[PDB]
Structure formats: C-alpha cells, structure tokens
C-alpha cells in the first residue's frame, strides 16, 4: 500500500477529551495533497476531519463512542485513496510516567523506585503495565527491563554492581480491556550504588 | 443472548472489584439498548470483558 499509515489514540488526554494521531509508515511520503478523515463509532456526527500538523494528522475530541470500529481514510479532495477499519480502544498510547525517584535504604540494603502516572485518576485507561529499564551508564544496549503493575519497584543492592553509576527510566502500556502501544519514556534518573 | 451475557459479566466484575469492567459492561448494555452499537460489536466487547475477568 502506497498510502500505508498507523495511528494511536490517547483517551482522556485533556480532561474528558480524547486524541487520535495518524502518520504514514513511510516518512518520505509527500502529504501536500493528502487529508485524513474518520467515520463511524463517533457520538453525534458521522465523520470528522483531521488537522494536518507538519508531518502528523491530529484530532482532539470527546465524540468517540469507544465501542466498535472506525474507518480512517486518506483522501485527495473527495477521492479516497486507502481506508482502514480501526478500533480506537486497541491503539491506545498511554501518557508517559513522571516524578521518577530512586532512594537507597541502608537498613534494608535495597533501592526503592517510585513514579507517578496520570492514568490512576482516569475513568477508561486506568490499568497499565509499566516497564522499568535500567543500565550501568557506561553500557550501550545492556538495559535490564522489569515489568510491574504498581508504581513502586524494589531492587536489591546485591543485584546491581557496587560503586557504579546507573540510569533508570519507566514507560507504560495498556493492560486490561484497552490495548495499544508503549508510552514515551519518562525522563531518566541517575544514581550511584553504594561502595559495599 | 448478548444482553444476558453482559448482565452476568457486570455482576462478576462487581464481585471481583473491577470498577472499570462494571462501567464498561453497563456502557455496552446501554449503547445496545439504544441501537448505538450492533449486536456483533457488543458481543466482541463482552468477549474482551470476559477475558479480563478470567485473569
């Protein structure tokens, strides 16, 4: 497909408003004459037009029914080039976690990793799986990934190298009725393990 | 019946303490009674709810 694209939704991203972001899978696609439209599984209206924003297509609206498939079409004026049936509840990209913090406790000989997510206060995409990734700063392609369903991870002092600089970051994916993609990574946090 | 499946799932989600699934099963029942969604889409949605409850 010459007009091959992919999308991600963000539910309750701005209060009760949801968002939908589409882009061509080939980044060199010339979008001069190309417009995007979504029809079906909408609340009061039949169709909605996307806003073209430099390289992506975006809609921010409350009018998503969130049950049933929507048809997203690429158009040249009124002619449809390609259409795709997408369920907006299966393409959710969570907002990134924030407020990442690592603390070392001498009494327990452990690192307590905590973070926050705005998804805990939402109605729909409340349940996520998180991915905490960490590495020794000096390394490239040597990240260790740990999954968790809460916002607190405990790492044992003996499972990390002593007297070393570590980098740690966290991301989330929907893990319940809603499916989708990994969020952006949170900013990195840097710490040093004790000398032992 | 799709409607009876959804009322069974809502009760199971209440018992399991899953407030998101209670809200979702009710939303699907409500939209189906109004003709806002098809029986096909309501049945696939009920199958997704049931799969999360099984976990």
Author numbering:
A (entry chain A): 36 to 231
B (entry chain D): 1 to 55
Quote the study on this structure.
We succeeded in solving crystal structures of five of the binder–target complexes, and all five closely match the corresponding computational design models. We anticipate that the binders created here, and new ones created with the method moving forwards, will find wide utility as signalling pathway antagonists as monomeric proteins and as tuneable agonists when rigidly scaffolded in multimeric formats, and in diagnostics and therapeutics for pathogenic disease.
